[PDB]
Amino acid sequence: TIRNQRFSLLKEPISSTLNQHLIDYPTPSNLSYWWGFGSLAGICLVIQIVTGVFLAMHYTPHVDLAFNSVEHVMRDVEGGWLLRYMHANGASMFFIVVYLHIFRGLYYASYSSPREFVWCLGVVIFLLMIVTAFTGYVLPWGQMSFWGATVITSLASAIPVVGDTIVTWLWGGFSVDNATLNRFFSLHYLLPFLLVGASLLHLAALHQYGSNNPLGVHSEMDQISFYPYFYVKDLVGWVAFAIFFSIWIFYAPNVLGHPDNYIPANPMSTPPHIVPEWYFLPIYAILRSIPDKSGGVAAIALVFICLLALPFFKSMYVRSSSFRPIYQGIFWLLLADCLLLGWIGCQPVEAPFVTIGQISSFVFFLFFAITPILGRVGRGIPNSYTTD
Amino acid sequence: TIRNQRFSLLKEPISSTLNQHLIDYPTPSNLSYWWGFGSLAGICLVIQIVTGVFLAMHYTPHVDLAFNSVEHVMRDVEGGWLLRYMHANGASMFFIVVYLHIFRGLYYASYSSPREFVWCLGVVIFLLMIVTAFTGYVLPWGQMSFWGATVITSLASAIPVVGDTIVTWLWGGFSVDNATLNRFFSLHYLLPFLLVGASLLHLAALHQYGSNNPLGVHSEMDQISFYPYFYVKDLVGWVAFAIFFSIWIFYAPNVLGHPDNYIPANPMSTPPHIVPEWYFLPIYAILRSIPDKSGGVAAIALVFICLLALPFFKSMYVRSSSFRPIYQGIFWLLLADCLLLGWIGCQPVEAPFVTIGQISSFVFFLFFAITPILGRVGRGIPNSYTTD
Amino acid sequence: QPADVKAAAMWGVAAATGGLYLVQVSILVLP
Amino acid sequence: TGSEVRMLDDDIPLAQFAVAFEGASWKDPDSIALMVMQAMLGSWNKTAGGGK
Amino acid sequence: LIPEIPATVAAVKNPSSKIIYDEHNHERFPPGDPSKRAFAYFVLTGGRFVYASLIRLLVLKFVLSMSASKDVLALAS
Amino acid sequence: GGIFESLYKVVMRRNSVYVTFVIAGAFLGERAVDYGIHKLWEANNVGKRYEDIPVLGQKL
Amino acid sequence: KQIVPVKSVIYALSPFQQKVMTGLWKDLPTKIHHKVSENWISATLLLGPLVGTYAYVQNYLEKEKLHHRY
Amino acid sequence: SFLDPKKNWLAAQHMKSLVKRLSKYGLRYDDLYDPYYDLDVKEALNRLPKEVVDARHARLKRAIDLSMKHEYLPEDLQAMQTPFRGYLQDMLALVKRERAEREALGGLPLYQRSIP
Amino acid sequence: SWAAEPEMEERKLMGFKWIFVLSLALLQAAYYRRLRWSVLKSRKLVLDVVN
Ligand SMILES: CCCCCCCCCCCCCCCCCC(=O)OC[C@H](COP(=O)(O)OCCN)OC(=O)CCCCCCCCCCCCCCCCC
Ligand code: HEM
Ligand code: HEM
């Protein structure tokens, strides 16, 4: 084939890269809907960006005007309550979808070779989402907003030699005042574009090494083009997600939040129950469970170290959980542990929740510490079960 | 060459794309210092983005706090005066180097085939730059910013069918007020990232077809890699630009500015001389020179029509103006006319400046209306000067 | 391996000097 | 001195090149070390039995 | 007589030690002379001095711009 | 020539030593330029600085 | 985007066997001669309109100033 | 009209200047035709003999080398230069005529420009 | 004028220092470029063509 005269626009250089990577990318023929969850997370990110821009057309980053500006958006702006509820509940759905993404990856062991770079870029993406959502939640400037900012920024003092200096520098002036508000608005506006860049790199690395499948096996025998076969599957996922998200926006918009964020920030009194948003609760529970706050920060760093250390395991030959009963049970126990851990974080430090959290976090790390053992034993399996 | 084992970390997939398109992309070995301006506009954009983010950590988009916040950055913030002068004079530098970029393209006929898409994406980038700089200049909320915004946005009501409707929608009310300031701030924050994307597409198209050269001839015979041969050339360019920028920051930080902007905006008083920044002056001059303001807006649209129509002209096989004496003289006349027209913009609208601007606009459009004729006539040169 | 250890130690010295030059903790250094 | 010469032909099937430093004299005591260095940079052939 | 062998062919078939370079904007050193390799390295070293100082300046300026301000410093009593 | 070659064999055989030398030279040159420019400033504008006004401490 | 081989023979020299910055000021008067001789048309076309327009504007401004100055 | 240097002083001066420039860089006027520009020049160069096309490539490489070095051809070869001794216009005219005929009666383009 | 520009002294000191230092950097960058390109800008190529 010499391309003398042009046949198809899709194969022209203007649409050639897009053609390959969107229409013609070969995909395993047996993918279920969790790959749809990955695409759905992308859509949630785009929704957040658009609604955030149109919200920032009305938000004043000053300490004396932020709360009343948000109430302006809700009451005066034409269809502004829709924008604000979409932004908040869209942050929530973004985190829900990313959690389902991560747990599918864990179940099917997609972190294994050769997708170590994909998993690591995913971990970086998760860090960026955490930071962006936190600094954004500081913006409305309520009781929960101000006090959560105070606590989570002041736990950065646990660094041995330069903790206090970093805390003061990040605060900008001995407290979490107007300077911190402007700082957080600028950072919240900036970070989503770095998040878009990270997502693009994530997808590029995956596209380099293909895509896993529910069997975990080599899958270059039966492969089909992405369009239209997986576009329609993703479309079904998107419409179902739209119905879910519309249930949340219109009928129960304040269920996923706390009522203390509707009181203007008053640094004098302290609300009796200071907790982050529901999607930071597992991390908050781990950190609160391990005492000696320096130990808590070290434990969070250890959580991310374990997450980054999953891909680089030794044998781990069989990949999918469909052929790993022990690992299947371990994964389900880990998921139950994560849900319980998230529930613990909303409870006070009074007993027995301290014991329950100190057990749950230990079980979390135990999952992360017993996967190589299963891999080694499984590597030992084939020379024992032979039927002859 | 079977890649059984790793040779070079540059050729590994993690660094392979960067390797190719930055270190190993072949470029003609006779490029002059006029391509460093293309290499340097990107540096100006990066400087603008970084300084703008660090400024936005201190700016308040309200109408009662914008000017005082800018002065806060001037005085209280450590190094804040450096940030603000860098941002302003860096917008000026960005436009200077982009104008040099454009005019080198015009001189060497880089717009000619096969780089029509490169030129068109450049024109779109120019639109984005103009809008970004304007909506950003409205931010400090001085007299010049307020009244320039009023005049220019009000001159969008020249469209016949809609007009006032679009103006009211754009203003968020009935006059340039707090809503317009907040809207302009959000848009100013967003647009530079679209500008980065457009720059990346610009570079992708150019790399598709390769860069031109002073002779304008086919140059796939003598080519060398980008690094290190053009890296050091661009380094010399960057350091010279740094000296220029340091002069314009530390010794003449307000020479390119307009003193009336240091007055807090007052909607009940109009400054005697409402003019835009020096880098909107030619456009403003054409707009004012054409009477019947609807006709002025039509002329402004026609300017971009001509710029986009440049690459789609007639045969004109010879492209570099080093071998085109008539086109060389025409180009020098065009550059002189653009400089003169820029001078006219700052002048009042009294005589004889009206006539001088009316002739200058006609010459500017005559440049575009004469080049196809030059190509058509020169299509038959070899048959006339042949030595047979 | 000994050469690698010496090279690593020298690179650590260089990085420490760079960090010290960046932060300028001459006031902090009491011991 | 240290320089290069490149005779591009493109009508020849195989490209051949030699890159050389400055060696040692006959009586230089380091010529034996240079011989050893050449030995540990040994020749390889497409028909060699050593293979990989 | 008849052939008039091409310039490149004659150059390839007749190697000579009297090699001639362009020497328009870069004059040759006399054939027997040591290469001034160190001098270029020290020139580049001075340039690198400057570049490191500039990078340090820019990083510190931005980071300490994000730091506290004279307003809050004076407010704290 | 000899001096340049000698300092070359001193400080240009390992890149870590070269980086340390570059950083140290940048620091020392920065401080020296600071001192020189300050001396020029003092020489140029004498009699204008803050601790020079005759009545600096008599507003009480 | 292919390379087009030419069948050349190229002699090059080490960058450390030849002086670097002397060629800048070597043969300077002839360089300035070229820069001025091959470009005076271009400078005339670039600057002539500007200085002519400035002279015309100043003449007109002064004449109007005198006429209107009572 | 058709204005040639024999019947036009201005055309004579124009031709003189073009001859001077091309002789300075030592490349014929036909060498300025970019194959990537028209794609009819690409076909015309595909139809020309290899000796002619190789001479064109050699002249272009010499010109580019002179441009990089910031110098001109030495006065000997400058006096030996022969610009406007064409080698391509007849073939280009034939190719364009064939394309015009094919387009005029039915026919699909034998070659097309990619987008972009 | 002080009240409108309290940063003049520090601003001018920084400007003088950095203009001087960046001029030195420009000299070094020019030397670096001329050294890298010295191989190409002094080559002799034989092309087998005359006119
Ligand atoms: C109080 C302090 C101490 C607390 C812990 C003490 C108990 C430790 C565990 C004891 C039990 C271990 C059992 C291990 C052997 C499992 C045998 C097995 O694989 O059986 C096959 C069965 C297949 O299931 P299926 O296919 O449905 O069967 C139909 C067959 N035609 O497979 C299955 O049914 C799958 C069962 C998977 C079970 C996984 C979890 C238990 C084993 C690991 C425990 C690790 C604990 C720490 C980590 C927890 C997670 C973070
Ligand atoms: C911004 C949020 C994210 C987006 C937009 C995103 C996007 C995507 C996309 C488009 C894919 C390819 C389609 C698919 O397989 O579902 C993918 C795959 C993948 N992602 Fe993400 N992702 C995100 C977050 C994460 C996180 C946090 C992780 C884990 C740390 C992760 C790990 C993976 C893995 C392992 C795959 C491989 C899929 C497979 O094995 O079949 N992603 N992601
Ligand atoms: C560049 C894009 C974005 C912009 C401009 C933006 C801007 C804003 C603004 C102005 C607010 C305050 C308005 C309000 O109180 O409702 C806000 C709130 C918030 N944003 Fe964003 N945002 C962006 C992207 C994101 C992303 C990607 C997330 C992560 C999920 C996020 C999470 C949040 C959260 C949690 C809040 C607080 C919700 C609340 O008001 O209760 N934002 N954002």
Ligand code: HEM
């Ligand atoms: C995301 C990147 C950017 C951000 C966050 C940003 C932010 C800001 C802010 C907060 C201001 C007001 C502060 C001040 O007036 O000095 C401002 C002003 C300005 N910006 Fe930007 N900007 C960005 C990019 C750009 C770019 C790319 C340009 C040029 C095309 C630009 C041109 C301007 C101009 C001309 C002003 C007015 C400066 C003045 O007169 O005081 N900005 N920008």
Ligand code: HEM
């Ligand atoms: C954000 C501003 C811009 C950036 C960063 C930019 C960047 C670049 C870069 C990196 C190149 C390749 C290096 C070079 O050839 O100089 C280039 C080439 C080019 N640009 Fe731009 N550009 C910008 C604006 C424009 C504009 C406004 C135009 C015209 C409308 C334009 C037209 C061109 C053309 C024609 C080339 C080809 C140069 C050649 O002849 O090889 N650019 N640009």
